[PDB]
Amino acid sequence: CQHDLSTRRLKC
Amino acid sequence: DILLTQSPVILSVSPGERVSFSCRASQSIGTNIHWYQQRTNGSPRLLIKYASESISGIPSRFSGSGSGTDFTLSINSVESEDIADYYCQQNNNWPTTFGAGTKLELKRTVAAPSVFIFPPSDEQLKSGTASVVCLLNNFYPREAKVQWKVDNALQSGNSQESVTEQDSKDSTYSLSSTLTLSKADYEKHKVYACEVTHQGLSSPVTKSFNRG
Amino acid sequence: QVQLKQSGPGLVQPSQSLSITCTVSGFSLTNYGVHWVRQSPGKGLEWLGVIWSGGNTDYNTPFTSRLSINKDNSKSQVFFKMNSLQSNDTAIYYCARALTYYDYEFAYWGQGTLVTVSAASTKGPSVFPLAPSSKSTSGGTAALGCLVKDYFPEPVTVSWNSGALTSGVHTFPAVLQSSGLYSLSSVVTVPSSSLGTQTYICNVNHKPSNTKVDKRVEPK
Ligand SMILES: *[C@@H]1O[C@H](CO)[C@@H](O)[C@H](O)[C@H]1NC(C)=O
């Protein structure tokens, strides 16, 4: 996946 | 370095169900594995140390097992609060390394969005830019269509969407669609409509206004 | 209560140095090591190093030559410095403490410090009201919000009525515009009957540009 620095959540 | 492979990438379960996260090591690491939770906007929270040992303050529904290279984190009855990413960490070998994480998503019943539309503020208009915001509130599942019309002209390429992460209480999503125009363009037109399509709607819902 | 508080988020120009301060309380740096971990879009979680009770440091291999960690025991402060940053050093940086003095299970984390490596410059947001009306009032429920527009870099914080209003609040993930600047909306749903009685204020803080704005949002 990808780590989203805005939400601090994984983003697929 | 030890490579930790977490699988699958995404888990999607219904509340009350049991769920398991897999952490596999590239090389035997004993029971030297730790687990973390990452909620939306949070820093990691330590759930389990050394494969199976409890951490104080962590609900009993969280447990872990395994040794060697094959590890499991378990939630015996998932609550909506459990929406998060989950990471494993090895420390049998220097340096300590983490897996890539598994996303936990919750299913729930279909919920149609509430739609609201917001004209540009007179405040914003003073800058030579107009944002028109269309809000889709508290719906499930994530898939939704927002179509923009200005004077029956289909708008394309000039809007941006943003979706919240899943809500920890009701498991829904909210969505903002923002249509952006020059002040000049905005002034040259009258009817601004966003049209919303969703599984929970029996037909598309349109929210709109006439400028002034 | 054990806590770690990091200095605020911000921009670092390419080839420049990162400085973050971790201020700990609820324990003594003479009894515990303090670790640094970052979280990047590509690599994910990555341990960077640690300063030990007695002042010794270890650095993860690829940061041997550009990472320095120090502390001031008396001030309960741990200082992290990393030289010559590049775009892929954009990450959330954290300080952490383990359960025991020698170990690596991280039970205590700083709130994190989002660092952006970019050649651009810092710019505060303009804050616009998203006013409730009939076009945004269905079944006794009204929606209202704030448009937080044209800032850089992330993050920006938004709360309502100084923290007193949290129920029904959605603050959207920012989106990058073609201008290279970020924009987000924060919305809340409230009883329409309270629109006359209650004041609704979105509190906007853009720490990287020292912009604090309180925007009152009223029916038009
Ligand atoms: C950034 O690029 C360097 C090469 O200059 C590479 O070795 C490193 O792993 C990259 N880091 C991230 C976080 O992508």
Side-chain angles (χ1 to χ4, degrees), chain A, chain B residues 1-168 170-212, chain C residues 2-220:
Chain A
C1 268
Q2 282 288 302
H3 311 75
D4 184 3
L5 303 188
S6 292
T7 68
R8 302 196 185 184
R9 292 294 308 288
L10 290 181
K11 192 179 191 66
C12 306
Chain B
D1 295 354
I2 307 306
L3 177 71
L4 296 178
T5 301
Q6 296 191 240
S7 88
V9 141
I10 309 178
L11 282 174
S12 169
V13 314
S14 313
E17 284 174 5
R18 190 179 180 100
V19 75
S20 288
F21 305 88
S22 170
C23 185
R24 295 175 158 89
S26 58
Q27 187 181 330
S28 182
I29 53 172
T31 47
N32 216 310
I33 205 82
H34 307 319
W35 293 89
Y36 299 86
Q37 175 185 65
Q38 192 166 32
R39 280 173 193 168
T40 296
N41 289 134
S43 315
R45 171 202 189 183
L46 175 67
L47 299 164
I48 301 291
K49 70 179 149 125
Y50 294 99
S52 51
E53 303 178 359
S54 273
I55 304 296
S56 83
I58 300 304
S60 69
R61 71 181 174 270
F62 292 94
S63 64
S65 73
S67 72
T69 60
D70 190 12
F71 300 98
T72 301
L73 174 66
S74 284
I75 313 177
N76 55 29
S77 201
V78 181
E79 300 178 9
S80 64
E81 292 70 30
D82 299 332
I83 292 168
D85 310 326
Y86 289 85
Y87 296 90
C88 62
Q89 177 206 5
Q90 75 78 22
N91 194 41
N92 185 77
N93 290 61
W94 189 98
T96 186
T97 52
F98 296 82
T102 291
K103 178 147 173 168
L104 179 74
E105 314 201 276
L106 253 74
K107 295 186 195 312
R108 56 153 290 156
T109 71
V110 173
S114 294
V115 186
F116 310 91
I117 187 168
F118 299 96
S121 68
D122 293 328
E123 290 80 350
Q124 183 188 12
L125 285 180
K126 292 189 184 167
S127 65
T129 309
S131 283
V132 188
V133 173
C134 177
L135 169 74
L136 284 56
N137 211 40
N138 296 7
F139 59 89
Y140 189 85
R142 193 186 210 269
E143 150 74 19
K145 292 296 181 168
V146 173
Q147 179 177 106
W148 284 96
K149 252 147 190 174
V150 177
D151 292 324
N152 283 335
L154 173 65
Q155 299 301 287
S156 179
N158 58 353
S159 71
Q160 290 179 314
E161 281 188 10
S162 181
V163 180
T164 46
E165 289 298 345
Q166 222 168 348
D167 190 87
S168 69
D170 59 41
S171 294
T172 72
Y173 297 96
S174 282
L175 185 145
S176 75
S177 181
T178 306
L179 176 77
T180 296
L181 315 157
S182 64
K183 182 189 172 194
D185 281 355
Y186 177 73
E187 292 300 346
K188 294 178 180 106
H189 298 107
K190 191 189 153 209
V191 168
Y192 294 84
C194 88
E195 212 208 42
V196 168
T197 295
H198 186 271
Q199 184 175 350
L201 297 176
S202 68
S203 54
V205 174
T206 297
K207 276 324 198 274
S208 62
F209 65 89
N210 307 339
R211 172 184 43 72
Chain C
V2 167
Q3 297 187 332
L4 301 75
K5 309 185 188 319
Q6 292 171 233
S7 43
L11 202 47
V12 170
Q13 301 304 132
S15 87
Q16 296 275 70
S17 54
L18 178 51
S19 289
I20 305 172
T21 286
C22 188
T23 300
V24 311
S25 64
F27 67 98
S28 167
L29 293 172
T30 63
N31 303 320
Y32 291 88
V34 166
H35 296 258
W36 294 84
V37 177
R38 72 174 177 181
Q39 195 171 32
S40 74
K43 289 220 177 168
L45 294 158
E46 183 174 24
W47 180 84
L48 304 168
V50 46
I51 188 154
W52 296 111
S53 297
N56 288 331
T57 55
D58 305 322
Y59 306 128
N60 199 351
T61 321
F63 313 94
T64 293
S65 74
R66 60 167 185 144
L67 183 48
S68 119
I69 309 173
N70 301 73
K71 68 187 190 153
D72 182 313
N73 284 335
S74 43
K75 281 143 78 153
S76 284
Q77 293 173 147
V78 175
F79 316 104
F80 171 96
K81 184 172 193 244
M82 190 179 65
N83 301 291
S84 65
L85 267 71
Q86 299 307 329
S87 273
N88 63 12
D89 292 315
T90 294
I92 302 161
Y93 292 79
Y94 299 88
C95 61
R97 205 210 85 178
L99 272 185
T100 55
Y101 76 90
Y102 56 84
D103 218 332
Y104 289 82
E105 78 281 75
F106 309 119
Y108 307 102
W109 293 75
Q111 82 281 19
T113 302
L114 174 54
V115 176
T116 304
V117 184
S118 170
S121 52
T122 310
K123 185 185 174 309
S126 298
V127 186
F128 301 113
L130 291 177
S133 79
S134 54
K135 296 300 179 174
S136 106
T137 296
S138 207
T141 286
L144 66 88
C146 277
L147 173 66
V148 181
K149 189 151 156 33
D150 301 335
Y151 61 94
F152 193 80
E154 274 264 88
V156 66
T157 63
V158 179
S159 72
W160 288 86
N161 297 0
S162 306
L165 180 57
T166 48
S167 151
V169 178
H170 299 302
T171 295
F172 291 101
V175 309
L176 193 67
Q177 304 161 117
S178 75
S179 69
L181 295 184
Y182 290 95
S183 177
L184 68 71
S185 281
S186 184
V187 304
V188 56
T189 48
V190 301
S192 64
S193 59
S194 79
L195 287 179
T197 308
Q198 281 295 330
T199 71
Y200 293 98
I201 296 205
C202 72
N203 315 110
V204 176
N205 196 356
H206 188 237
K207 265 156 177 164
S209 73
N210 297 312
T211 303
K212 270 174 58 161
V213 173
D214 286 340
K215 180 82 215 173
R216 165 80 172 276
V217 175
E218 277 165 9
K220 250 198 66 160

